[PDB]
Amino acid sequence: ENQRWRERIRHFAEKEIAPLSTTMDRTATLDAGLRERLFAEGLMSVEIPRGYGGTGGTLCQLILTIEEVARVDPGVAVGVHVHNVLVAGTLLRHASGDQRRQYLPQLATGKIGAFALSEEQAGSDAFALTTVARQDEGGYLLTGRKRWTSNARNADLLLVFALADGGPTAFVVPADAPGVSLDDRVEQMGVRAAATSDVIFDGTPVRTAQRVGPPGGGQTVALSGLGLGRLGIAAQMTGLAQGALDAATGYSRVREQFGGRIADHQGVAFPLADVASRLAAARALLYRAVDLHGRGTDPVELMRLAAMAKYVASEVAERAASVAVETLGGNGYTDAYPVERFYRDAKAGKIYEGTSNVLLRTIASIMIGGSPGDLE
Amino acid sequence: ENQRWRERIRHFAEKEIAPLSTTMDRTATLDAGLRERLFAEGLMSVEIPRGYGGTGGTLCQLILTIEEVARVDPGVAVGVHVHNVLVAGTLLRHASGDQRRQYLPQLATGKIGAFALSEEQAGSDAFALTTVARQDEGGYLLTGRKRWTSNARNADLLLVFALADGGPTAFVVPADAPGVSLDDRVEQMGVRAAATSDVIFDGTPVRTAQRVGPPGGGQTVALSGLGLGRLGIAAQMTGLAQGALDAATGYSRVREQFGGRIADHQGVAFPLADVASRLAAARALLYRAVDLHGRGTDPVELMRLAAMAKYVASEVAERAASVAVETLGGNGYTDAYPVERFYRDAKAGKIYEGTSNVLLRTIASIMIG
Ligand SMILES: Cc1cc2nc3c(=O)[nH]c(=O)nc-3n(C[C@H](O)[C@H](O)[C@H](O)COP(=O)(O)OP(=O)(O)OC[C@H]3O[C@@H](n4cnc5c(N)ncnc54)[C@H](O)[C@@H]3O)c2cc1C
Numbered sequence: 001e002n003q004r005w006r007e008r009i010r011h012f013a014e015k016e017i018a019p020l021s022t023t024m025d026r027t028a029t030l031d032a033g034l035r036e037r038l039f040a041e042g043l044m045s046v047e048i049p050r051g052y053g054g055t056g057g058t059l060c061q062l063i064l065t066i067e068e069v070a071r072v073d074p075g076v077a078v079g080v081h082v083h084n085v086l087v088a089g090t091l092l093r094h095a096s097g098d099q100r101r102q103y104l105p106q107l108a109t110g111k112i113g114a115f116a117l118s119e120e121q122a123g124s125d126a127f128a129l130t131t132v133a134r135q136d137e138g139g140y141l142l143t144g145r146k147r148w149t150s151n152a153r154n155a156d157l158l159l160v161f162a163l164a165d166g167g168p169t170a171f172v173v174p175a176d177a178p179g180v181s182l183d184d185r186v187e188q189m190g191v192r193a194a195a196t197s198d199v200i201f202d203g204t205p206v207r208t209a210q211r212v213g214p215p216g217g218g219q220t221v222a223l224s225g226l227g228l229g230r231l232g233i234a235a236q237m238t239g240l241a242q243g244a245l246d247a248a249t250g251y252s253r254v255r256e257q258f259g260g261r262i263a264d265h266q267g268v269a270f271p272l273a274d275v276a277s278r279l280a281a282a283r284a285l286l287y288r289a290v291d292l293h294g295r296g297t298d299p300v301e302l303m304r305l306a307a308m309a310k311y312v313a314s315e316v317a318e319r320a321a322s323v324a325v326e327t328l329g330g331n332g333y334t335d336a337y338p339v340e341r342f343y344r345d346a347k348a349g350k351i352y353e354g355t356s357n358v359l360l361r362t363i364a365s366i367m368i369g370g371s372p373g374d375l376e
Numbered sequence: 377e378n379q380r381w382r383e384r385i386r387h388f389a390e391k392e393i394a395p396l397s398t399t400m401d402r403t404a405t406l407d408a409g410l411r412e413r414l415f416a417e418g419l420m421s422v423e424i425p426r427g428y429g430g431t432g433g434t435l436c437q438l439i440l441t442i443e444e445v446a447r448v449d450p451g452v453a454v455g456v457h458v459h460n461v462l463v464a465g466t467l468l469r470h471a472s473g474d475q476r477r478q479y480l481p482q483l484a485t486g487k488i489g490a491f492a493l494s495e496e497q498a499g500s501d502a503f504a505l506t507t508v509a510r511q512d513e514g515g516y517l518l519t520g521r522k523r524w525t526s527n528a529r530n531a532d533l534l535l536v537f538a539l540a541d542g543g544p545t546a547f548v549v550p551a552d553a554p555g556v557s558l559d560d561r562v563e564q565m566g567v568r569a570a571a572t573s574d575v576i577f578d579g580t581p582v583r584t585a586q587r588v589g590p591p592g593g594g595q596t597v598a599l600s601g602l603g604l605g606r607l608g609i610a611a612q613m614t615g616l617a618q619g620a621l622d623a624a625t626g627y628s629r630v631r632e633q634f635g636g637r638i639a640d641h642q643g644v645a646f647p648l649a650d651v652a653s654r655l656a657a658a659r660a661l662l663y664r665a666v667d668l669h670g671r672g673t674d675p676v677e678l679m680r681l682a683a684m685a686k687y688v689a690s691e692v693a694e695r696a697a698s699v700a701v702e703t704l705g706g707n708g709y710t711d712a713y714p715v716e717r718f719y720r721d722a723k724a725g726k727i728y729e730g731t732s733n734v735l736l737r738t739i740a741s742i743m744i745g
Pocket residue numbers: 082115116117118120122123124125147148149150151188191196348351352353354355356357358361631633634638641643644702703704705706707709
């Protein structure tokens with residue numbers, strides 16, 4: 001069943017995504033035809049139940065979706081990850097019956113979800129927010145600025161975190177609500193198909209019915225998806241590494257210098273074998289961490305395994321992309337091949353859903369006792 | 377004196393290059409104003425003797441010039457390296473007196489030199505050329521296609537290698553000669569201020585006096601500049617690494633999260649100190665290799681030292697840029713800071729002037745026999 005699912009996403013990514021990747025990366029756009037296909041074929045609703053217009057599939061199927069998309073286009077995979085894992089997944093866990101019936105069919109059919117937590121001064125210290133939802137009759141008036149919102153220029157629904165007068169609180173806010181605007185602000189090095197924007201709120205009206213969970217319950221809402229967010233990026237990094245390794249292996253069989261294929265030199269072959277070995281271990285850890293979901297496994301152990309999976313997969317993605325650029329020589333430094341894009345894309349995996357240091361802080365803290373804040 | 381030279385290039389790079397780097401990288405252009413300043417301030421003639429209109433400086437000063445330019449813009453540094461080291465430097469050391477007297481003043485004053493050796497099927501196997509110089513009355517007709525020519529869209533003079541009906545042979549060819557055209561062909565990841573093109577020759581006429589050395593002398597002309605080429609790129613990598621470390625150290629002191637500067641954490645400070653240590657060793661090896669030039673040193677020992685300096689410096693540049701991107705977090709992934717450009721630029725250093733595997737093969741061959 002999961003072999004058939006893998007093959008279906010692989011075929012989709014190779015036929016529908018690959019021919020558009022170079023242009024989506026240069027222009028930082030999501031192709032309109034591809035967007036219609038992502039929704040139609042179920043890549044935007046993998047775990048959303050059938051009763052809300054979703055695929056009704058498993059965490060395993062969602063992880064395989066992100067992996068096989070990422071194998072061809074890590075940038076498209078960011079949008080798929082944010083939408084399914086962070087936005088639809090948060091509503092499946094925390095939204096009321098009414099909120100699920102209102103938003104899940106939209107996310108399953110045609111409305112893209114983006115996740116707006118970070119700010120200029122709230123990065124690793126993610127809840128040092130200055131965006132405020134001020135009380136009003138019937139709900140709130142939202143004012144502030146979010147930074148690094150992936151897929152913002154393509155999004156219809158924002159899951160936004162703001163101080164309720166009261167502590168961090170989660171809201172669902174339409175991207176076209178009064179007082180909402182975007183500032184693309186900067187060029188980013190990779191995952192450009194889902195490039196970030198700043199999101200600006202200028203007294204945007206939000207009804208009480210848009211609040212997800214209680215006032216000051218924003219950190220609990222975010223924390224429930226932390227582990228799953230890290231597995232989704234571990235899957236994106238595993239797929240990226242596979243795509244890099246597939247390009248380098250195939251090239252090494254056909255490029256000839258000095259009268260024979262470059263694969264016949266141990267200086268070319270050995271780095272590929274080393275990457276392949278590390279990638280088999282990264283994938284085994286990812287699928288182990290996924291398998292231990294829905295088993296009543298200790299939550300701390302799940303947090304540990306998700307942080308370790310993302311840390312290891314990120315490392316292997318960097319190594320794979322690096323080795324792949326070098327295996328291809330000058331061609332590997334160009335857009336004629338995908339490996340320079342994979343190299344630019346891989347670096348985003350060390351920054352979002354927990355920087356390397358934030359992951360190691362968490363992991364060490366579980367192993368030696370104390371909290372992450374005790375480690376200097 | 378070298379301390380004064382270093383500060384003069386540093387000041388130049390921070391004032392005249394830094395404000396243009398972002399634009400030059402996105403558009404893959406050399407700014408016209410900057411181009412005039414490179415010639416006027418002597419960066420395009422560092423070791424060309426004053427008798428040709430040059431600066432009259434030393435190899436040590438040329439190496440420092442490449443390093444300080446690369447600390448701000450590794451892409452502009454490619455163009456400076458290829459012009460001074462591979463084109464003007466090769467003519468100074470191998471061309472006839474008439475060729476030196478004709479071409480060095482033009483390279484000193486306004487004509488950019490580029491170096492056209494590589495082809496689609498001639499990469500690491502650099503001499504498996506298919507471009508041909510066919511004999512004709514009073515010279516040759518060149519036909520073929522070169523690949524990976526840095527700075528080609530800005531160049532006025534090309535040092536071109538071709539099979540003379542004799543083996544590989546070197547020619548000086550004007551970029552506007554009959555039958556010469558460029559094909560940019562692809563988008564490259566970095567060093568984009570000096571982005572490559574293909575150079576196409578369609579029966580380009582060359583006179584005998586444009587040939588540098590004898591027919592079949594092209595390897596000798598190319599290999600003779602391989603050592604100095606590797607030192608130039610070692611300087612480019614060392615400079616890139618410094619620029620990355622400068623941005624990361626400066627940022628670590630001003631970015632606060634969790635109520636203090638990120639430099640107060642060992643997970644941020646240690647990687648910067650590790651990079652700083654490895655860069656101090658890469659720079660010491662570079663300046664050792666440079667110091668042993670112009671002294672009658674065993675040529676094999678100079679080739680070993682140049683290969684090792686480039687290999688080590690390349691590796692430090694990769695670690696420095698990688699650490700700098702992650703030190704800056706999201707900001708490091710964006711063009712608001714120079715470190716993502718450094719990260720894209722650094723990877724070029726592992727490919728040109730000898731790939732990592734070609735350097736290790738050369739070093740092992742010397743050490744093992
Ligand atoms: C391409 C991209 C996509 C993104 N997508 C989204 C998204 O869609 N929505 C969203 O809300 N956010 C998103 N983010 C933001 C992302 O979560 C943050 O960039 C990340 O949390 C790091 O914060 P920062 O950039 O402010 O870096 P900082 O927190 O400033 O970190 C800078 C450096 O200091 C280190 N550091 C910080 N504190 C410590 C410590 N205590 N000990 C050790 N080292 C420390 C970090 O590890 C890093 O090396 C995205 C970011 C990028 C680059």
